[PDB]
Symmetry: none
Subunit: 348 residues, 2 copies
């Protein structure tokens, strides 16, 4: 009966409804309950015939197990998604993460908990916003998915939708009273992830929904992380949308300019100089009260190398591909004072 | 495990460095990024273990988190100082404000941005002048802290030092080429604040550095602000020291007198009559005076004498001349925050 569990999982995973039905016919429901509750290990995943079938889109197998062998939707396995290992995953969760709307439709109609949480505390709803499948998104919340359950890292459906550019999902969740101002563990809001990824449509949608402007846990506003991530269009939307002060306008322009320069041989030397110079023009608009650039402390000075402190010194290295890379490094340290921890919270 | 986060925060709170260091022994990298980035909500404050450590002076804990666990000095929180909510406060901003000197250069030496601005554009420099801690002030300036980074209401570190009466910090700032003539959103200069608070030693210093006596947002010179704040020492200095117009002398004295008669049940009628009586000592070519109901300003000294003991009529004469000369303070005070 041990290896009989080998053939049940094979037939369910491959979608062979007629094969699976034959292996279960005329067996005790002590053995039937044993076989459909067996957790197999194969492609790095531990799951039941219910889960692997749901994960693979095999609806006729899912319908057979649900309504004919009366399998509990509660059962949880551990699956692989986007390189991540996800413990405590239900068949509902897998189905929503792989875009199997009719697998999701069956499982719900047989009473599956659409708010069941993985060990990552990820929900079927979250798994669906990850992929931006708005049809599954609308259906789950229509069947009472809590749009406010964040993952272990306090990351929200709205956050990951905003990060991956799913405009339609972002707009929908806000219509469903999603909280615009929730803060993840790192402190970012949905506006931070949208800005950092360059999705200007979602930036517009977030501000039109009265999204608050805040700093994350490292002193960064959406304007600043948009500038560090070199999202020039977002930077120039935010440089006028709010009433950011003179100092905020200069630092965004300088962080933006510096961010263009990191791959030393190939960066656009024009756009680097262009945003660096626009900042100094602003720094010098009044010839009497000049916003002088801050000097680095002596114990952190870049040797005999100093930031250009006037328009002419900047024009002096305008064509020097290497000197402008040096400038960017100084500007970023003079302003910005890892990504692994922010990526793990954006996970499905 | 989310309860373990709070235990690490509690340890960094009380400076209990050793029970903290052990709470992080034998632990994953993913876990410490969770435990050392965890924003805990104690009271109205939101802060990480690095920040409340620095806010409470526990240099033992800050170096533990900085050197052993690679916590970035850019960690920002929200903290409560002097009744205000400060967003974007770094660990170095908190230590400079709560006067923790060896924590400050611990952080600065470890590369903490000395010119970090909070959401209110407050700097670690300003946080230290507010408290008048000259040793911390000079250490930041010697590490190139920009003296001219004013807060979002244009309040300079000179201004706050003057207002809070920190004399030796004022003159040190002026020795470092601080612009004495800078104006806040109120239109007020360090001289105005010093006058309003009555710090005669700082009022002397700004003149010694040739600050300008010009009007503010309410159109009032530091002379007139010192007299409205009932600061008799500095009004007498500002008249005597300068070339000041004679009408400036009738006006400063009259207003100084009227301003002592606010709390009418318990105020100095002796001082209210005194200053009003010197005002007409210098009027009565006799310079005459510039009608609410049936109550007009006192003309003759016989009229001022006839109410010398009427606690109420002097109060009314106060309100009357107070409006003749003049005719709010909330955004001035908000700008004077840390």
């Amino acid at each position: 009966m041990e290896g009989l569990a080998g053939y049940v999982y094979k037939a369910a995973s491959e979608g062979k409804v007629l094969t699976l039905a034959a292996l279960l016919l005329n067996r005790s429901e002590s053995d039937i309950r044993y076989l459909l509750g067996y957790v197999s290990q194969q492609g790095g995943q531990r799951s039941t015939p219910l889960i692997i079938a749901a994960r693979n889109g095999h609806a006729k197998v899912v319908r057979l197990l649900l309504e004919h062998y009366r399998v509990q939707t509660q059962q949880t396995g551990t699956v692989r998604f986007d390189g991540y290992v996800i413990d405590g995953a239900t068949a509902l969760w897998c189905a929503a993460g792989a875009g199997h709307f009719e697998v999701v439709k069956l499982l719900v109609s047989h009473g599956a908990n659409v708010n069941h949480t993985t060990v990552t505390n990820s929900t079927p709803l979250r798994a669906a916003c990850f992929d931006g499948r708005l049809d599954i998104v609308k259906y789950l919340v229509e069947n009472n998915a809590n749009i406010s359950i964040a993952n272990k890292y306090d990351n929200t459906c709205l956050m990951i939708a905003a990060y991956k550019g799913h405009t339609d999902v972002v707009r929908y969740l806000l219509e469903q009273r999603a909280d615009p101002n929730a803060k993840a563990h790192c402190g970012a809001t949905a506006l931070h992830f949208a800005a950092e990824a360059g999705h200007i449509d979602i930036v517009k949608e977030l501000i039109k929904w009265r999204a608050a402007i805040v700093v994350n846990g490292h002193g960064m506003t959406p304007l600043k992380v948009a500038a560090e991530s070199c999202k020039a269009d977002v930077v120039e939307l935010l440089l006028s949308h709010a009433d950011c002060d003179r100092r905020s306008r200069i630092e965004a322009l300088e962080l933006l300019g510096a961010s263009f320069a990191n791959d030393r041989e190939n960066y656009d030397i024009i756009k680097t100089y262009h945003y660096l110079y626009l900042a100094m023009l602003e720094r010098f608009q009044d010839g009497d009260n000049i916003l002088e650039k801050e000097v680095l402390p002596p114990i952190h000075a870049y040797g005999n190398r100093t930031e250009c402190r006037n328009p002419q010194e900047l024009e002096s290295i305008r064509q020097d591909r290497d000197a402008l890379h040096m400038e960017g490094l100084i500007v970023r340290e003079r302003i910005l004072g890892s990504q692994k921890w922010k990526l793990i919270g954006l996970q499905r």
